[PDB]
Amino acid sequence: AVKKFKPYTPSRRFMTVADFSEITKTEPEKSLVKPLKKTGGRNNQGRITVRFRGGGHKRLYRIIDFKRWDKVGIPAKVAAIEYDPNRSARIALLHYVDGEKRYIIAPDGLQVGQQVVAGPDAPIQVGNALPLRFIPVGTVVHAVELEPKKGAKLARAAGTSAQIQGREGDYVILRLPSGELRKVHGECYATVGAVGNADHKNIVLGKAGRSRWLGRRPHVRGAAMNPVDHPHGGGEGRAPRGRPPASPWGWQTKGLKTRKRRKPSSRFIIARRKK
Amino acid sequence: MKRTWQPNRRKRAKTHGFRARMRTPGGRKVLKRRRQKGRWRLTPAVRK
RNA sequence: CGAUGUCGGCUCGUCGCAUCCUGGGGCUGAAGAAGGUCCCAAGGGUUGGGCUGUUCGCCCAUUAAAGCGGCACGCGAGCUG
RNA sequence: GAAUGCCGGCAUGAGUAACGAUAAAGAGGGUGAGAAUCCCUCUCGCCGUAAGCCCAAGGGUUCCUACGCAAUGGUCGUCAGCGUAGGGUUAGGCGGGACCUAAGGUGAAGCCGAAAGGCGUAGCCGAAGGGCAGCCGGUUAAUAUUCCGGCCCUUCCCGCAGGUGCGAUGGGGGGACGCUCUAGGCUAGGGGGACCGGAGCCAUGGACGAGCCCGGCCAGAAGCGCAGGGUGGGAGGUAGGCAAAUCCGCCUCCCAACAAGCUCUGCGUGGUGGGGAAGCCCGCGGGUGACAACCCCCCGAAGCCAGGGAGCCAAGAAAAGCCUCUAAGCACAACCUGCGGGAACCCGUACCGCAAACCGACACAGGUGGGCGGGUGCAAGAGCACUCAGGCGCGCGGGAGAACCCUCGCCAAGGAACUCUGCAAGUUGGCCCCGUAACUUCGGGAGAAGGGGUGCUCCCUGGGGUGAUGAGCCCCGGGGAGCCGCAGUGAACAGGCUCUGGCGACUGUUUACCAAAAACACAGCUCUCUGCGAACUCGUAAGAGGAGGUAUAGGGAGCGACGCUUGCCCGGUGCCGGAAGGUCAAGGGGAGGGGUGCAAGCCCCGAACCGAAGCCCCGGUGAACGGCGGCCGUAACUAUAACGGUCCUAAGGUAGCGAAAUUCCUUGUCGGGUAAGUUCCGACCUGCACGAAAAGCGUAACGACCGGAGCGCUGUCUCGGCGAGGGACCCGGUGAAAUUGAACUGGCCGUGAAGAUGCGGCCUACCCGUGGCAGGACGAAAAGACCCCGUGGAGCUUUACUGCAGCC
RNA sequence: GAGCUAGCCCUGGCCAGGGUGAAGCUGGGGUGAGACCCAGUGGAGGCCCGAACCGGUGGGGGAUGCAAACCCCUCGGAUGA
RNA sequence: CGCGGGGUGGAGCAGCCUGGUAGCUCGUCGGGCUCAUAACCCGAAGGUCGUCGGUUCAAAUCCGGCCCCCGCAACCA
RNA sequence: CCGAGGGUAGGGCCCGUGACUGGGGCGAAGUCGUAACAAGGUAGCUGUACCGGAAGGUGCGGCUGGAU
RNA sequence: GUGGGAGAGGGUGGUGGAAUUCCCGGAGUAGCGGUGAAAUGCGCAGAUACCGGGAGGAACGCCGAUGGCGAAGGCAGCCACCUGGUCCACCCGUGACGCUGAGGCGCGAAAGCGUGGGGAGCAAACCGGAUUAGAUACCCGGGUAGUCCACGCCCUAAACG
Ligand SMILES: NC[C@@H]1O[C@H](O[C@H]2[C@@H](O)[C@H](O[C@@H]3[C@@H](O)[C@H](N)C[C@H](N)[C@H]3O[C@H]3O[C@H](CO)[C@@H](O)[C@H](O)[C@H]3N)O[C@@H]2CO)[C@H](N)[C@@H](O)[C@@H]1O
Ligand SMILES: [Mg+2]
Ligand SMILES: [Mg+2]
Ligand SMILES: [Mg+2]
Ligand SMILES: [Mg+2]
Ligand SMILES: [Mg+2]
Ligand SMILES: [Mg+2]
Ligand SMILES: [Mg+2]
Ligand SMILES: [Mg+2]
Ligand SMILES: [Mg+2]
Ligand SMILES: [Mg+2]
Ligand SMILES: [Mg+2]
Ligand SMILES: [Mg+2]
Ligand SMILES: [Mg+2]
Ligand SMILES: [Mg+2]
Ligand SMILES: [Mg+2]
Ligand SMILES: [Mg+2]
Ligand SMILES: [Mg+2]
Ligand SMILES: [Mg+2]
Ligand SMILES: [Mg+2]
Ligand SMILES: [Mg+2]
Ligand SMILES: [Mg+2]
Ligand SMILES: [Mg+2]
Ligand SMILES: [Mg+2]
Ligand SMILES: [Mg+2]
Ligand SMILES: [Mg+2]
Ligand SMILES: [Mg+2]
Ligand SMILES: [Mg+2]
Ligand SMILES: [Mg+2]
Ligand SMILES: [Mg+2]
Ligand SMILES: [Mg+2]
Ligand SMILES: [Mg+2]
Ligand SMILES: [Mg+2]
Ligand SMILES: [Mg+2]
Ligand SMILES: [Mg+2]
Ligand SMILES: [Mg+2]
Ligand SMILES: [Mg+2]
Ligand SMILES: [Mg+2]
Ligand SMILES: [Mg+2]
Ligand SMILES: [Mg+2]
Ligand SMILES: [Mg+2]
Ligand SMILES: [Mg+2]
Ligand SMILES: [Mg+2]
Ligand SMILES: [Mg+2]
Ligand SMILES: [Mg+2]
Ligand SMILES: [Mg+2]
Ligand SMILES: [Mg+2]
Ligand SMILES: [Mg+2]
Ligand SMILES: [Mg+2]
Ligand SMILES: [Mg+2]
Ligand SMILES: [Mg+2]
Ligand SMILES: [Mg+2]
Ligand SMILES: [Mg+2]
Ligand SMILES: [Mg+2]
Ligand SMILES: [Mg+2]
Ligand SMILES: [Mg+2]
Ligand SMILES: [Mg+2]
Ligand SMILES: [Mg+2]
Ligand SMILES: [Mg+2]
Ligand SMILES: [Mg+2]
Ligand SMILES: [Mg+2]
Ligand SMILES: [Mg+2]
Ligand SMILES: [Mg+2]
Ligand SMILES: [Mg+2]
Ligand SMILES: [Mg+2]
Ligand SMILES: [Mg+2]
Ligand SMILES: [Mg+2]
Ligand SMILES: [Mg+2]
Ligand SMILES: [Mg+2]
Ligand SMILES: [Mg+2]
Ligand SMILES: [Mg+2]
Ligand SMILES: [Mg+2]
Ligand SMILES: [Mg+2]
Ligand SMILES: [Mg+2]
Ligand SMILES: [Mg+2]
Ligand SMILES: [Mg+2]
Ligand SMILES: [Mg+2]
Ligand SMILES: [Mg+2]
Ligand SMILES: [Mg+2]
Ligand SMILES: [Mg+2]
Ligand SMILES: [Mg+2]
Ligand SMILES: [Mg+2]
Ligand SMILES: [Mg+2]
Ligand SMILES: [Mg+2]
Ligand SMILES: [Mg+2]
Ligand SMILES: [Mg+2]
Ligand SMILES: [Mg+2]
Ligand SMILES: [Mg+2]
Ligand SMILES: [Mg+2]
Ligand SMILES: [Mg+2]
Ligand SMILES: [Mg+2]
Ligand SMILES: [Mg+2]
Ligand SMILES: [Mg+2]
Ligand SMILES: [Mg+2]
Ligand SMILES: [Mg+2]
Ligand SMILES: [Mg+2]
Ligand SMILES: [Mg+2]
Ligand SMILES: [Mg+2]
Ligand SMILES: [Mg+2]
Ligand SMILES: [Mg+2]
Ligand SMILES: [Mg+2]
Ligand SMILES: [Mg+2]
Ligand SMILES: [Mg+2]
Ligand SMILES: [Mg+2]
Ligand SMILES: [Mg+2]
Ligand SMILES: [Mg+2]
Ligand SMILES: [Mg+2]
Ligand SMILES: [Mg+2]
Ligand SMILES: [Mg+2]
Ligand SMILES: [Mg+2]
Ligand SMILES: [Mg+2]
Ligand SMILES: [Mg+2]
Ligand SMILES: [Mg+2]
Ligand SMILES: [Mg+2]
Ligand SMILES: [Mg+2]
Ligand SMILES: [Mg+2]
Ligand SMILES: [Mg+2]
Ligand SMILES: [Mg+2]
Ligand SMILES: [Mg+2]
Ligand SMILES: [Mg+2]
Ligand SMILES: [Mg+2]
Ligand SMILES: [Mg+2]
Ligand SMILES: [Mg+2]
Ligand SMILES: [Mg+2]
Ligand SMILES: [Mg+2]
Ligand SMILES: [Mg+2]
Ligand SMILES: [Mg+2]
Ligand SMILES: [Mg+2]
Ligand SMILES: [Mg+2]
Ligand SMILES: [Mg+2]
Ligand SMILES: [Mg+2]
Ligand SMILES: [Mg+2]
Ligand SMILES: [Mg+2]
Ligand SMILES: [Mg+2]
Ligand SMILES: [Mg+2]
Ligand SMILES: [Mg+2]
Ligand SMILES: [Mg+2]
Ligand SMILES: [Mg+2]
Ligand SMILES: [Mg+2]
Ligand SMILES: [Mg+2]
Ligand SMILES: [Mg+2]
Ligand SMILES: [Mg+2]
Ligand SMILES: [Mg+2]
Ligand SMILES: [Mg+2]
Ligand SMILES: [Mg+2]
Ligand SMILES: [Mg+2]
Ligand SMILES: [Mg+2]
Ligand SMILES: [Mg+2]
Ligand SMILES: [Mg+2]
Ligand SMILES: [Mg+2]
Ligand SMILES: [Mg+2]
Ligand SMILES: [Mg+2]
Ligand SMILES: [Mg+2]
Ligand SMILES: [Mg+2]
Ligand SMILES: [Mg+2]
Ligand SMILES: [Mg+2]
Ligand SMILES: [Mg+2]
Ligand SMILES: [Mg+2]
Ligand SMILES: [Mg+2]
Ligand SMILES: [Mg+2]
Ligand SMILES: [Mg+2]
Ligand SMILES: [Mg+2]
Ligand SMILES: [Mg+2]
Ligand SMILES: [Mg+2]
Ligand SMILES: [Mg+2]
Ligand SMILES: [Mg+2]
Ligand SMILES: [Mg+2]
Ligand SMILES: [Mg+2]
Ligand SMILES: [Mg+2]
Ligand SMILES: [Mg+2]
Ligand SMILES: [Mg+2]
Ligand SMILES: [Mg+2]
Ligand SMILES: [Mg+2]
Ligand SMILES: [Mg+2]
Ligand SMILES: [Mg+2]
Ligand SMILES: [Mg+2]
Ligand SMILES: [Mg+2]
Ligand SMILES: [Mg+2]
Ligand SMILES: [Mg+2]
Ligand SMILES: [Mg+2]
Ligand SMILES: [Mg+2]
Ligand SMILES: [Mg+2]
Ligand SMILES: [Mg+2]
Ligand SMILES: [Mg+2]
Ligand SMILES: [Mg+2]
Ligand SMILES: [Mg+2]
Ligand SMILES: [Mg+2]
Ligand SMILES: [Mg+2]
Ligand SMILES: [Mg+2]
Ligand SMILES: [Mg+2]
Ligand SMILES: [Mg+2]
Ligand SMILES: [Mg+2]
Ligand SMILES: [Mg+2]
Ligand SMILES: [Mg+2]
Ligand SMILES: [Mg+2]
Ligand SMILES: [Mg+2]
Ligand SMILES: [Mg+2]
Ligand SMILES: [Mg+2]
Ligand SMILES: [Mg+2]
Ligand SMILES: [Mg+2]
Ligand SMILES: [Mg+2]
Ligand SMILES: [Mg+2]
Ligand SMILES: [Mg+2]
Ligand SMILES: [Mg+2]
Ligand SMILES: [Mg+2]
Ligand SMILES: [Mg+2]
Ligand SMILES: [Mg+2]
Ligand SMILES: [Mg+2]
Ligand SMILES: [Mg+2]
Ligand SMILES: [Mg+2]
Ligand SMILES: [Mg+2]
Ligand SMILES: [Mg+2]
Ligand SMILES: [Mg+2]
Ligand SMILES: [Mg+2]
Ligand SMILES: [Mg+2]
Ligand SMILES: [Mg+2]
Ligand SMILES: [Mg+2]
Ligand SMILES: [Mg+2]
Ligand SMILES: [Mg+2]
């Protein structure tokens, strides 16, 4: 569910927040958090590389286990489910029987207190990680390693999920959340089930202040700029594009495929994303 | 109104200080022309 | 063009007569009253308001009459903008 | 002799403007050659969430004292932040270092770059953050949490006694955290007292009184009390915390849990140490007061207990000190506890510190971070008025009482007639109560509008807090009866309101120094890219950002809440798709030809054919770039044309709106408002030249936006008058400036490069000032910024030319 | 050269007082259970009035200025972008 | 009044590097089909090429002059 | 004190009126098409949605009040 | 009440096959498709037709009926869970507890609306081809919402026996 508000102020009229029903623990684990380096779009040269970033709320980076193969066979218990501000997903605090506490992305349906286990001997039930060759075909997964032993790189946002469409040799075929069919190796790990907090996209921010709280600075339109700042700028009065819609650096932004054609990953991608 | 000069001895010594000119190659040339010219102040006078 | 500040308004006037009024007249298709036209005459006077940046113009209510122009389309080392 | 030349000097304006907040001065005495200006006393005024006090930054001897006034002081000067000299800054506890880490900087390893140099996990540097042991008084002309007095405390070393497996840069715990609201108990602070202490006072009609005036505390170790914070104890297993671990984490069981115990902090008491007024005397302090009293009640913090609690989402630093664990190593050591003795370094310490000492060239009406910031009255409050403590009267004065200007007060009758415009100035104003419309997204509109009350006295009465359940004190009320004045938030501080249209939804942001808007931004909608060593961006690279993110994510673009919707054209351009074909460079291939040599050879051309991207070509694509016609005829009055013909296109504007922020003709025409309306509003539509995300049409709420109207009220106006203060004016002191070819500088009619003080002819005019007004000197100012010229420059654009980065 | 200014990172601080009264919670009604309604509590908000503080709307003054951006009256925000 | 484009049968358009041919559609008229109209089928007629000059053996065509019609331009002050 | 009434301010209902606009009713012989009645020449009607000079058409679902 | 019976009655979660379309490979060539007749269209860039593989969505042939169920709307592969209604027998229990029902509350085909997904086929609007005097239609070739799911609205009908 998504919590709404009465229109007591103009911003509270459309502003919506999450239900936060799955969160059981308020503060995070002290042995797993570390500070987050706020950049504000600035690189090591001190220049803005990514425009309009900064001014967000202070955050602490929660160390998330994106491997799960450090502890193969050792079961864990979902001690609590907390909120991570560095992502859209909610996290699950895991107390292993070995004694080590860890954090993973909380999948949808993961209840507090149940037991999860990673490895090829693990059963097929939400929260368990297995290599892609042992997960049955047709089941939805997440936290998928793209290449073996490199960490979870796929299906990490809230409400996302990938489905095994088949196997072919040493690799498996996967429908990514973009609808792309890709051939990923079978030894790559993946946690079964879809990611929780599926109502994340239904959050209306309500006002400009909420974007500034998240770190989203105001985006300036190129038409509102001048010719030295953008190609769309200029023209006495409001004016249309007058050229194909381009970025401030010159490249067009309406249809230009910027993917390198000679990339070696093209040999493993079956179908490009659609819709 | 607020003028351009709001002194700070910390800023004075870390911007135009002797160690600041000696780190950068352009600042070592500043000290070369300044010794060659014969200036009595090679860097601005700051106290602490 | 090593600068002559540009419309209109306000304030301040001054002049010209090709006279709006007032005065003196001739003719009349001038009975009277009131007009039309022309001649003499610049001494004084020539309202308030609605619209518009407006000059002008239209309109309202009056008036003896609500004149036309010149003065760097008078007047920003007087003002407004 | 000129270059708005350069450097210097001195003129002119001119004894002119000004003398830097309109907070305000007067008299007496003294010093001195000299006094409106220095010192003293008295009176008056001004600040008092400061114009008072402390701290930080900055400044760097301006501090204190003595002798001085050439210059600095917008005047004067015996004075001074000025000149000369001397003195003055005392720390184990305050701040910084010998402790820690943040951003960032540096940087063994390592990586990169013609060179210079650029990166870089560790480590180190880095503070107003973490950690850390002193409070009260006295003293000096000047320093004091620093010296002195009193009472406390910390670290290090050594010794002694007891205890323990002691031991680290390593493991773990802790440090360790947001925003808003807030409980209980204290404290700071404040108010009152019929009580305590005190020098005195009874005035001018009254009062010897529960009279007036003044004061009634500070700090304080261990104890003790109160209020809070932190924390479970044991046993067994243990594969994790990069070795070890008895610690931590995980599992099981037992003991008990709104407690208790232990520990820590605050507050009160606390041995004891201080302080102590008004007034009066001696002259900016001292003595006395005084053997000073040193109690009781109430209010009560935003501060303390504190690392409290609760709620919310935007999810809220690190590391060391500190405790524990064990490792080498050592267990004659080492660590802890207690006691005693010794040791305890470097730097800062004056003074200004919302300002005459900082930043603004000035002793400049500007700018400057933190803490304290009393009382009374106004609903509260840091607002406002007066006023404690404390500090000032702003470093030119004295006169006069012209025009004019600034600032302010008032006005008959009218009431916007003023004017681009109610611009400005009025009106309204706070609180309590009654009451409140269209419309609405049901919150709003709304402080709608409009209206009544408000002071004082007396009587009766309700509730709460502190006390105790009562008095007393404090807070919030209710009713009745009266009194006064023109008027009761009696002064000061406080919305004028409504109807209606345009634009933008809104709060916001913006041209620092002419524009705050309708522009920008915004949540929200859509398109497009991107599968992660992502796209994109910065960089030669390395490396970063993106992101320690993973398509519910990230980049780019346009539109901009919301409601109803966003129609047709893919011919051109862009993009996307296309194993064909055409063209296509290097290269491959080498039919054939050439140069030379006696020759083998050596050398140079070189056709067919193979041969990528791109372009051509075929499709697709509009919330991609964009575009969405012309003529003629037709209805049984006329008029118009639902209908038709024809030409062209890639297709000919759909809905909705329309003389509009768009309408040239135009003040279109009609209606409404007005006595009158080039504006406004509602319609009509022959839309010069609206139109559907450079969005179209609406839309509650919002707006220092822009129009139009009405009520209220007014010096805006008819139409101006009077009064106040600061200048102007006069006198004393100081005393500029831009400007200036020289000047002995009238008017008119002419003339002259065509607008004459200077020429001509007339007319007029004794010489020289002061206050004023501005028509002229084509007045001053700025080598016109509009215009053109220059084969001048620069920003910008693109299917201009050429090249580069980039990508293929 | 970022001691002015523009943005961002790190660590701190500041925002008197008053008003409106969202969710949630409690109680009652309602139902088959609900939705929902009312009362109380509660104290949310790019909420309101209003200082400090940050601005700079309109007008007046200032124009060799107190000031190379100021002063007076008035005005915007002031728990948040 | 400055540039560009066009005036051709009753209507709308071609024919113009092109000198010598005037063509397409609708309409009109005559005959069919039908009871009758319309549609359709068959067969016809229909043009001073805006006007006046000039060039030429020959002007709708090429070149001028006016007469209309349409579309742009009318800028810095 | 009450008090007819008068004044001020804001509401509610009703009536009359208004440039213009929307559909409607009616009025022998105007115009365009031919939707329905026969399988009315695409079976009809219907609710809804979109479009079109106009009857109407089309999509989805329903009905027979549809012949062979 | 006991003991049984039929059924597409409803909701949830799974799952099977045929067929259409699209992709990839094989093989193959001069047309396919479509109509009353054609044309647009697709097709030497290798289509149709054929074989094999894969993805995705929707609907369930035969059974199937003149059938069944539900109050209506409506409900059809299959499996399972949750669940409503109805009928028969026994004659066991309560002992009129009944019938209807203004309001109210609930359900309510299709189309439509909001948020999000999904979109194979079909298909308003739209475009093209033909028919026609015209054809904003019938016919054809494309084609977007929609059709499908979850949740929330809408509450109409020839909701008819
Ligand atoms: N009956 C009122 C409405 O009439 C409409 O029709 C109205 C018009 O459409 C209709 O016009 C008709 C026309 O259809 C028909 N083809 C030709 C006829 N001459 C006209 O007739 C009309 O006009 C003429 C004069 O002009 C009058 O004399 C006559 O009464 C009138 N009916 O006449 C009606 C007015 O009388 C609709 N048919 C109908 O739905 C509706 O009921
Ligand atoms: Mg949920
Ligand atoms: Mg709600
Ligand atoms: Mg709103
Ligand atoms: Mg936290
Ligand atoms: Mg940590
Ligand atoms: Mg760095
Ligand atoms: Mg750098
Ligand atoms: Mg940024
Ligand atoms: Mg994290
Ligand atoms: Mg934003
Ligand atoms: Mg954040
Ligand atoms: Mg934007
Ligand atoms: Mg611009
Ligand atoms: Mg730039
Ligand atoms: Mg550009
Ligand atoms: Mg542009
Ligand atoms: Mg452009
Ligand atoms: Mg401009
Ligand atoms: Mg324009
Ligand atoms: Mg522009
Ligand atoms: Mg554009
Ligand atoms: Mg480009
Ligand atoms: Mg300053
Ligand atoms: Mg300077
Ligand atoms: Mg400093
Ligand atoms: Mg020297
Ligand atoms: Mg000139
Ligand atoms: Mg000159
Ligand atoms: Mg006037
Ligand atoms: Mg005059
Ligand atoms: Mg005369
Ligand atoms: Mg006369
Ligand atoms: Mg007569
Ligand atoms: Mg006269
Ligand atoms: Mg005269
Ligand atoms: Mg006259
Ligand atoms: Mg006028
Ligand atoms: Mg006007
Ligand atoms: Mg005019
Ligand atoms: Mg002139
Ligand atoms: Mg003239
Ligand atoms: Mg003229
Ligand atoms: Mg003039
Ligand atoms: Mg003048
Ligand atoms: Mg002027
Ligand atoms: Mg003027
Ligand atoms: Mg002049
Ligand atoms: Mg102007
Ligand atoms: Mg103006
Ligand atoms: Mg010379
Ligand atoms: Mg000279
Ligand atoms: Mg002079
Ligand atoms: Mg004088
Ligand atoms: Mg003078
Ligand atoms: Mg003077
Ligand atoms: Mg003077
Ligand atoms: Mg002074
Ligand atoms: Mg004296
Ligand atoms: Mg003497
Ligand atoms: Mg002071
Ligand atoms: Mg100085
Ligand atoms: Mg000195
Ligand atoms: Mg001194
Ligand atoms: Mg002196
Ligand atoms: Mg002197
Ligand atoms: Mg002097
Ligand atoms: Mg001075
Ligand atoms: Mg002397
Ligand atoms: Mg001195
Ligand atoms: Mg000491
Ligand atoms: Mg220290
Ligand atoms: Mg040492
Ligand atoms: Mg360090
Ligand atoms: Mg470096
Ligand atoms: Mg350093
Ligand atoms: Mg510190
Ligand atoms: Mg500190
Ligand atoms: Mg210390
Ligand atoms: Mg003392
Ligand atoms: Mg000391
Ligand atoms: Mg002291
Ligand atoms: Mg011990
Ligand atoms: Mg030990
Ligand atoms: Mg340790
Ligand atoms: Mg933390
Ligand atoms: Mg937070
Ligand atoms: Mg006290
Ligand atoms: Mg008090
Ligand atoms: Mg007291
Ligand atoms: Mg007496
Ligand atoms: Mg271990
Ligand atoms: Mg104590
Ligand atoms: Mg004393
Ligand atoms: Mg004594
Ligand atoms: Mg505070
Ligand atoms: Mg807490
Ligand atoms: Mg919050
Ligand atoms: Mg760190
Ligand atoms: Mg360290
Ligand atoms: Mg040392
Ligand atoms: Mg000191
Ligand atoms: Mg001080
Ligand atoms: Mg201060
Ligand atoms: Mg001072
Ligand atoms: Mg001064
Ligand atoms: Mg100075
Ligand atoms: Mg000053
Ligand atoms: Mg400031
Ligand atoms: Mg300040
Ligand atoms: Mg009072
Ligand atoms: Mg008050
Ligand atoms: Mg206070
Ligand atoms: Mg005050
Ligand atoms: Mg005072
Ligand atoms: Mg005083
Ligand atoms: Mg008056
Ligand atoms: Mg009046
Ligand atoms: Mg107006
Ligand atoms: Mg005003
Ligand atoms: Mg009204
Ligand atoms: Mg209300
Ligand atoms: Mg009121
Ligand atoms: Mg009184
Ligand atoms: Mg109390
Ligand atoms: Mg006052
Ligand atoms: Mg007031
Ligand atoms: Mg107010
Ligand atoms: Mg308008
Ligand atoms: Mg706005
Ligand atoms: Mg907006
Ligand atoms: Mg702003
Ligand atoms: Mg500005
Ligand atoms: Mg400037
Ligand atoms: Mg504004
Ligand atoms: Mg401004
Ligand atoms: Mg704009
Ligand atoms: Mg956004
Ligand atoms: Mg939108
Ligand atoms: Mg770059
Ligand atoms: Mg990162
Ligand atoms: Mg990190
Ligand atoms: Mg826009
Ligand atoms: Mg469109
Ligand atoms: Mg449409
Ligand atoms: Mg259309
Ligand atoms: Mg069309
Ligand atoms: Mg196109
Ligand atoms: Mg195209
Ligand atoms: Mg195309
Ligand atoms: Mg071929
Ligand atoms: Mg070759
Ligand atoms: Mg090629
Ligand atoms: Mg085009
Ligand atoms: Mg006719
Ligand atoms: Mg119009
Ligand atoms: Mg008009
Ligand atoms: Mg007009
Ligand atoms: Mg006009
Ligand atoms: Mg009409
Ligand atoms: Mg119309
Ligand atoms: Mg137009
Ligand atoms: Mg558009
Ligand atoms: Mg717009
Ligand atoms: Mg628009
Ligand atoms: Mg509009
Ligand atoms: Mg609405
Ligand atoms: Mg505004
Ligand atoms: Mg605003
Ligand atoms: Mg006046
Ligand atoms: Mg007076
Ligand atoms: Mg005066
Ligand atoms: Mg005088
Ligand atoms: Mg004078
Ligand atoms: Mg003379
Ligand atoms: Mg002449
Ligand atoms: Mg002359
Ligand atoms: Mg002479
Ligand atoms: Mg002469
Ligand atoms: Mg003059
Ligand atoms: Mg001049
Ligand atoms: Mg020049
Ligand atoms: Mg300029
Ligand atoms: Mg030019
Ligand atoms: Mg030029
Ligand atoms: Mg040239
Ligand atoms: Mg030349
Ligand atoms: Mg040039
Ligand atoms: Mg600089
Ligand atoms: Mg800065
Ligand atoms: Mg609140
Ligand atoms: Mg607010
Ligand atoms: Mg303060
Ligand atoms: Mg201002
Ligand atoms: Mg100025
Ligand atoms: Mg204000
Ligand atoms: Mg406010
Ligand atoms: Mg015939
Ligand atoms: Mg017959
Ligand atoms: Mg016929
Ligand atoms: Mg120009
Ligand atoms: Mg121009
Ligand atoms: Mg009455
Ligand atoms: Mg039909
Ligand atoms: Mg029919
Ligand atoms: Mg039919
Ligand atoms: Mg239509
Ligand atoms: Mg259709
Ligand atoms: Mg039915
Ligand atoms: Mg029938
Ligand atoms: Mg698909
Ligand atoms: Mg069957
Ligand atoms: Mg029986
Ligand atoms: Mg329904
Ligand atoms: Mg449906
Ligand atoms: Mg056709
Ligand atoms: Mg289809
Ligand atoms: Mg659609
Ligand atoms: Mg039926």
Q: What is the resolution of this structure in A?
A: 3.1
- Strand D close to A156 by CB, under 7 A: yes
From the CA of A99, the nearest ligand is 92
What is the dihedral sign for C-alpha A125, A131, A133, A139? Answer: positive
Measure A238 CA to D424 C1' (Å). Answer: 37
Nucleotides of H under 7 A from a protein CB: 15, 54-56, 115-116, 118-119
Residue A145 near residue A180 (C-beta atoms within 8 A): no
CA B15 to chain centroid:
6
How would you classify the pairing of strands A2-3 and A17-18?
antiparallel
To the nearest 5 percent, what fractions of chain B are helix, strand and coil?
A: 55, 0, 45
Q: What angle do CA A270, A271, A275 make, to 5 degrees?
A: 160
SS3 category, A269: strand
The owner of tokens 């936290």 is: A143
Give whole-number Cα distances, A234 to A230, A237, A247, A253, A263, in Å: 9, 8, 15, 19, 38
Spatial CA neighbour of A131 closest among A164, A180, A92: A164
DSSP per position, A72-137: SS--EEEEEEEE-TTSSSEEEEEEETTS-EEEEEPBTTPPTT-EE-BSTT--SSTT-EEETTTSPT
Determination approach: X-ray
Q: Which helix (H) or strand (E) holds B28?
A: helix B25-37
d(CA A134, CA A150): 19
The owner of tokens 């002290």 is: A30
d(CA A197, CA A4): 16
**Ligand 215 centroid from CA A198, angstroms:** 27
d(CA B5, CA B23): 25
The owner of tokens 């599926």 is: A198
d(CA A55, CA A213): 7
**Ligand 7 centroid from CA B44, angstroms:** 27
**Ligand 164 centroid from CA A53, angstroms:** 27
Amino acid code (one letter) for A123: P
Q: Which helix (H) or strand (E) holds A173?
A: strand A171-175
The two three-digit tokens of residue A266, written as one number: 């093209």
- Strand D close to A2 by CB, under 7 A: no
Computed on alpha carbons and rounded to an integer, the radius of gyration of chain A in Å comes to: 22
Nucleotides of D under 7 A from a protein CB: 57-60, 103-106, 116-117, 119-120, 172-177, 238-241, 248-251, 312-318, 358-360, 366-368, 441-443, 505-507, 519-524, 527-539, 543-546, 548-562, 574-577, 620, 624-626, 694-695, 700-701, 795-799, 805, 807-808
Q: Which helix (H) or strand (E) holds A271?
A: strand A269-271
